[PDB]
Amino acid sequence: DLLSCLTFNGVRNHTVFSADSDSDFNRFLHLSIQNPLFQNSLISKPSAIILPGSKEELSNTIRCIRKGSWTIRLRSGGHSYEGLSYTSDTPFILIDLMNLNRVSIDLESETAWVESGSTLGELYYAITESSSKLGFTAGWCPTVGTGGHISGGGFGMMSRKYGLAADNVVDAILIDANGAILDRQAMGEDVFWAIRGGGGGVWGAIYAWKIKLLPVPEKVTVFRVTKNVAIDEATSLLHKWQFVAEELEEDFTLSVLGGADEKQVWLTMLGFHFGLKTVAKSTFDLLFPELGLVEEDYLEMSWGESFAYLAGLETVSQLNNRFLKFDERAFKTKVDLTKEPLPSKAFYGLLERLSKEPNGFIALNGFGGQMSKISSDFTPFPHRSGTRLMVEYIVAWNQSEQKKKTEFLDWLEKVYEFMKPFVSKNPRLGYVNHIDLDLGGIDWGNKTVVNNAIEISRSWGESYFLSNYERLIRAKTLIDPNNVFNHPQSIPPMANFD
Ligand SMILES: *[C@@H]1O[C@H](CO)[C@@H](O[C@@H]2O[C@H](CO)[C@@H](O[C@@H]3O[C@H](CO)[C@@H](O)[C@H](O[C@H]4O[C@H](CO)[C@@H](O)[C@H](O)[C@@H]4O[C@H]4O[C@H](CO)[C@@H](O)[C@H](O)[C@@H]4O[C@H]4O[C@H](CO)[C@@H](O)[C@H](O)[C@@H]4O)[C@@H]3O)[C@H](O)[C@H]2NC(C)=O)[C@H](O)[C@H]1NC(C)=O
Ligand SMILES: *Cc1cc2c(c(*)c1C)N[C@]1(NC(=O)NC1=O)C(=O)N2C[C@H](O)[C@H](O)[C@H](O)COP(=O)(O)OP(=O)(O)OC[C@H]1O[C@@H](n2cnc3c(N)ncnc32)[C@H](O)[C@@H]1O
Ligand SMILES: *[C@@H]1O[C@H](CO)[C@@H](O)[C@H](O)[C@H]1NC(C)=O
């Protein structure tokens, strides 16, 4: 009996299923559903939601759930593009980690222990409060949870300088399928490697991450400038952008958000420099004068301020608000990684397609810099040297546009097909933090599929992990041979014939 088990172990914060919009259950379920695509009444719902308040409670929660037949779901920030932290085709218990959001900074070692329910914003805020000369490399969305994000890699505006969040993890506490509480020494190097990018919801429950804090200057420079242009100019800008993104030294990042509506194209240029505005502007004046940036576009501020600003927040304080919703639209997104430069026609066609669907947008990031200096097998994220760009295609809509859902999905499908020739091939590469079920999924309830799970899974597995897929399967067998942590695209354990 689950409830008696939780009570016996003093895991007191839990609620059982109820449809009442008023119920604490429904409120907690919806609190961290960060893609409204998955909020409706016909979606699968948990039989109970448990909010463990310590590593011991998390351990005992897993143990209690194991006594029954339920599927475990872990949720940190709830940002799964495919809602995989709070949906399941089989009855399930949702372990919501929002109360495990403590950040402990050690300024003597310049490291931090970060409970896995902490959001990126909570982490950034904690760091800024402790020091004006330390930061951390992770994504730009402040409400993303560290649990999912670091488990999948974690790319952001400082990745060209410092790599992924997962590339800067030096220890972690993993709670395994039997509730065992394991640090790096206890879990071993294969498992410690797998958790640093091998995907959330696969290895066990991360309780906390120990991260290395990273130097930042007291003043950095950023800009966020939207150019309103026509398609010919936008194409010229994007085509040159891909090279500048690369010719820039690691102390600079220039990224782009873009979209259109008939004749009008908008390109939002996001810039970050590890340094002062005189140097930042001089560099873009020389390398990319076509951007037409002026002195007033460049803002000098602290690292903490810069991360709040790039996210469009009003204040650094807002980083610490995990429930602040800046964009409450349902969305679907796909992503590509490139190995060869994109021809101008690829950007032209992308822009033409965006002009026909104003609810669509693209997000463009260059790799290079430190991303090319990290070996493909340092952590499970393999897209290092030779990888040029990450290109994201997004379509998003509010509730008033819900009837157009299929139209938006059609547009996104067509955009991804259009880009096929220009982007990585054999296989077409992906990124596990941009999990995409279009690639397929495992029905763990189907014996025939399960027998063939490894090779069925190679489709998306090689896309996300390339040559690292094999070691991930070895690590999965080590830490979760009974496949307690599973989802449609989780790494399968090795075939066993005992
Ligand atoms: C399972 O987990 C969930 C998720 O964590 C739990 O739900 C959370 O429960 C929290 C309470 O335990 C609740 O926090 C509350 O959040 C509200 C905002 O919605 C916040 O205003 C509350 O903060 C007040 O109360 C706490 C003590 O509970 C104080 O520490 C705090 O200082 C606040 O009191 C002050 O402000 C109040 C007005 O807001 C005044 O009425 C009060 O007098 C006091 O004012 C004095 O101090 C002020 C500051 O110096 C000063 O300005 C003033 O003049 C006075 O001197 C409270 O923290 C969360 O909202 C809730 N989270 C969610 C998602 O629902 C849940 O309880 C758990 N369930 C179980 C079974 O354990
Ligand atoms: C919603 C959103 C997502 C992203 C971005 C912004 C916004 C608003 N921006 C990103 N773009 C970038 O270039 N960099 C960004 O950060 C982006 O990539 N992005 C997607 C997120 O990074 C990922 O979706 C990330 O995995 C989400 O993390 P989180 O909020 O924790 O997501 P969850 O749905 O709770 O979990 C994801 C998977 O991981 C498992 N999991 C959660 N917590 C776990 C712990 N503690 N241990 C083990 N596994 C855990 C979940 O079960 C789920 O499978
Ligand atoms: C199991 O999977 C196989 C392969 O996808 C499929 O042919 C079959 O219909 C499935 N069986 C069940 C019980 O759904």
Swiss-Prot record:
Location of the FAD-binding PCMH-type domain: 42-216
Gene3D superfamilies associated with the record: 3.30.465.10, 3.40.462.20, Uridine Diphospho-n-acetylenolpyruvylglucosamine Reductase, domain 2
Disulphide connectivity of cysteines: C5-C64
One Pfam family per UniProt: BBE
Post-translational modification: The FAD cofactor is bound via a bicovalent 6-S-cysteinyl, 8alpha-N1-histidyl FAD linkage.
Pathway: Alkaloid biosynthesis; (S)-scoulerine biosynthesis; (S)-scoulerine from (S)-reticuline: step 1/1
Catalytic activity entry: (S)-reticuline + O2 = (S)-scoulerine + H2O2 + H(+)
GO terms of biological process kind: alkaloid metabolic process
Cofactor(s) required for function per UniProt: FAD; a metal cation
Subcellular location(s) of the protein: Cytoplasmic vesicle
Sequence similarity: Belongs to the oxygen-dependent FAD-linked oxidoreductase family.
Function statement: Essential to the formation of benzophenanthridine alkaloids in the response of plants to pathogenic attack. Catalyzes the stereospecific conversion of the N-methyl moiety of (S)-reticuline into the berberine bridge carbon of (S)-scoulerine.
Name of the protein described by the UniProt record: Reticuline oxidase
Organism: Eschscholzia californica
Gene that this sequence comes from: BBE1
